[PDB]
Amino acid sequence: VPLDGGRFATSDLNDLYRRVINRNNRLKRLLDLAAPDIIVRNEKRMLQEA
Amino acid sequence: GNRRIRSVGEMAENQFRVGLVRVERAVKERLSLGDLDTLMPQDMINAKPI
Amino acid sequence: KKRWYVVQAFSGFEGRVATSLREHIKLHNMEDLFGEVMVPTEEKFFPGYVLVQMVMNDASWHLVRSVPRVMGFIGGTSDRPAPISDKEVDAIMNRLQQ
DNA sequence: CTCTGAATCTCTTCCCGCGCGCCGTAGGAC
DNA sequence: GTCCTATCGATCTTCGGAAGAGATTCAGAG
Numbered sequence: 001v002p003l004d005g006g007r008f009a010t011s012d013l014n015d016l017y018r019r020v021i022n023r024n025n026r027l028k029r030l031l032d033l034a035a036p037d038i039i040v041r042n043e044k045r046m047l048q049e050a
Numbered sequence: 051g052n053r054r055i056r057s058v059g060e061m062a063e064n065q066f067r068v069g070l071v072r073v074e075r076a077v078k079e080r081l082s083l084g085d086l087d088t089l090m091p092q093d094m095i096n097a098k099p100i
Numbered sequence: 101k102k103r104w105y106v107v108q109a110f111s112g113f114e115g116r117v118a119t120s121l122r123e124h125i126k127l128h129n130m131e132d133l134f135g136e137v138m139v140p141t142e143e144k145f146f147p148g149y150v151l152v153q154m155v156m157n158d159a160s161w162h163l164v165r166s167v168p169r170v171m172g173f174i175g176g177t178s179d180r181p182a183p184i185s186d187k188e189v190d191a192i193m194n195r196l197q198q
Numbered sequence: 199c200t201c202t203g204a205a206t207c208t209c210t211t212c213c214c215g216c217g218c219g220c221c222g223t224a225g226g227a228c
Numbered sequence: 229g230t231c232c233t234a235t236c237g238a239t240c241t242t243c244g245g246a247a248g249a250g251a252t253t254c255a256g257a258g
Contacts, residue, residue: 171237
C-alpha cells in the first residue's frame, strides 16, 4: 500500500519473500552452473536460514 | 544515592559519541589505504554518521 | 605449490578489493605466497567472489582477512578453509579462455 | 554403566477500551 | 546526472523480569 502518496509502505512479508526468492534464484544458478560443495553449502544454508 | 540523573546534556553527548565511533570505523580504513598525498581532512570525514 | 581459494568481498567494490589485495601483498612482502587474483568477466560472474591463488599459513590468512572490505573465506570450516577443485579451476579457466 | 533423583537452559505469558502526537527503504554504481 | 541490489562472508543485539513449566544434563549408586 502507498504511504502519503506513492511512497511504498511495504507489508513486511514482501521482504521475506524477496529474501527467499533471491536465494532461490541464486541457488538454481549455482546448481545449474555446477558450483562445488563449499559454495552451495553457502547458498543452501542462506536459503534455509531465510 | 545509587541512582543518578542523566539529563539532556549527557544523553546527547552519548549519542554524539556513537557518531564519532562510526566515523572512527571509516576514517581508520580510509587513512590506512589512502595515499595521504591527496587527502585533506574534509575528504577523510563526512557528516552523515554524526 | 599454490592452490586456489575463494574470498568474499562487499559485492560492488570487487575491483578495489582486488587492487588493495595486490597492494597488501606488496606491502607485507609475502610475494612467494600469492600467485594471482582473478575476477572473471563476460561481455560478470561470479557476483561478489574473488579467486586467489595462495597457500595456507595462518599469517597469510590473517593477511587476506586484514585486507579491507573482505568478509572472509568460504569453506567447510574457519580453522582450515577449503580449496575448490582441479577440474573446477580448469573449467573456470576454460570459460574465461572461451 | 546407566537408573531415578535433581540442575541449567529456553519458551511462553503478562487487562480492555480510547484518544491524540510523530516517523516510517541505502550506500553504492554507471 | 544516476537505478538500484543488500545486509558485521575484518561487530557486538544490553544487564533493571519473574515465573513457570518443560527439554535437556548430570549425581550416588546396584
